[PDB]
């Protein structure tokens, strides 16, 4: 149930 | 943590979250010991009985965090692993003897109000403080209850 | 080293709500 992280950290 | 309380902001600025990339989930806690080095339990990374054997690319470390699930924009820093080092005599077979591992980060992390390393003990600090009845502090985003 | 001194506590001479419980145990 984690919020999405930026894709730059893959 | 069972029967704990909410941390205050910046109360544990060396706390690090080990985060699995694909299935995004909490793996484990960890700690910041310099701008490039993070300390953790070997069993967080390598534990055959639980089919755990992570490689660098499987995970991220998240530093400066407070919220478990939220992405903490402008506060947390997310770092990639250069290299994992497990104690060569870590005993995953019997009793978790020498349950320790280091993780080198790809780039140094910038210190802030929320990100700051903890000290490692010298012989004298260890001798004086590691005594029955003396209290330490444990922090984490793990389960609040056994079941 | 600057290790183990927290910007929001030690660095500002502010105590957190339970650190005194640790100190009191170091008899």
């Amino acid at each position: 149930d984690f919020e999405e992280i930026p894709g730059e950290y893959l | 943590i069972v029967e704990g309380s909410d941390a205050e902001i910046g109360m544990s600025p060396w706390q690090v979250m080990l985060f699995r990339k694909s299935p995004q989930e909490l793996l484990c806690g960890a700690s910041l010991i310099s701008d490039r080095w993070v300390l953790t339990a070997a069993h967080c990374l390598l534990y055959p009985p639980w089919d755990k054997n992570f490689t660098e690319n499987d995970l991220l470390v998240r530093i400066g965090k407070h919220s478990r699930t939220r992405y903490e924009r402008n506060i947390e820093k997310i770092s990639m692993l250069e290299k994992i080092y497990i104690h060569p005599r870590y005993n995953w077979r019997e009793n978790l003897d020498r349950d320790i591992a280091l993780m080198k980060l790809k780039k140094p992390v910038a210190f802030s109000d929320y990100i700051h390393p903890v000290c490692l003990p010298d012989r004298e600090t260890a001798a004086s403080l590691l005594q029955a009845g003396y209290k330490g502090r444990v922090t984490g985003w793990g389960n609040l209850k056994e079941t | 080293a600057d290790c183990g001194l927290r910007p929001l506590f030690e660095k500002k001479s502010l105590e957190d709500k339970t650190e005194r419980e640790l100190l009191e145990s170091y008899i």
Binding site: - | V2, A30, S31, H43, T125, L130, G136, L144 | -
Partner: protein
């Protein structure tokens, strides 16, 4: 079962006979245990997900926080008569230093 934010608990280091007598597992000098006894009233423990995190102490000598332990293992969480085990960071510091010095 899961927290919204980082959780904290303060726990007393336990006498080594008491740690050994709480479990069938072989305890080594590279481990120590912590937590309250059933007689003591207060409770608290680490649990799954907490492993690898730090057990820290604030030196009364120089007001700095030191990481004395790494959350390592327990049998259940916050069970009466059971305790959390922690990796003894100082006893493994020579390895720590060797790796960092590369």
């Amino acid at each position: 079962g899961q927290p919204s934010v980082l959780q904290v608990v303060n726990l007393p280091i336990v006498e080594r006979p008491v740690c050994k007598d709480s479990t069938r597992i072989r305890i080594t000098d590279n481990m120590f245990c912590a937590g309250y006894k059933p007689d003591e009233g207060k409770r608290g423990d680490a649990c799954e997900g907490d492993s690898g995190g730090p057990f820290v102490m604030k030196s009364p000598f120089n007001n700095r926080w030191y990481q004395m332990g790494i959350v390592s293992w327990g049998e259940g969480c916050d069970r009466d008569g059971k305790y959390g085990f922690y990796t003894h960071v100082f006893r493994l510091k020579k390895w720590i230093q060797k790796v960092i010095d590369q």
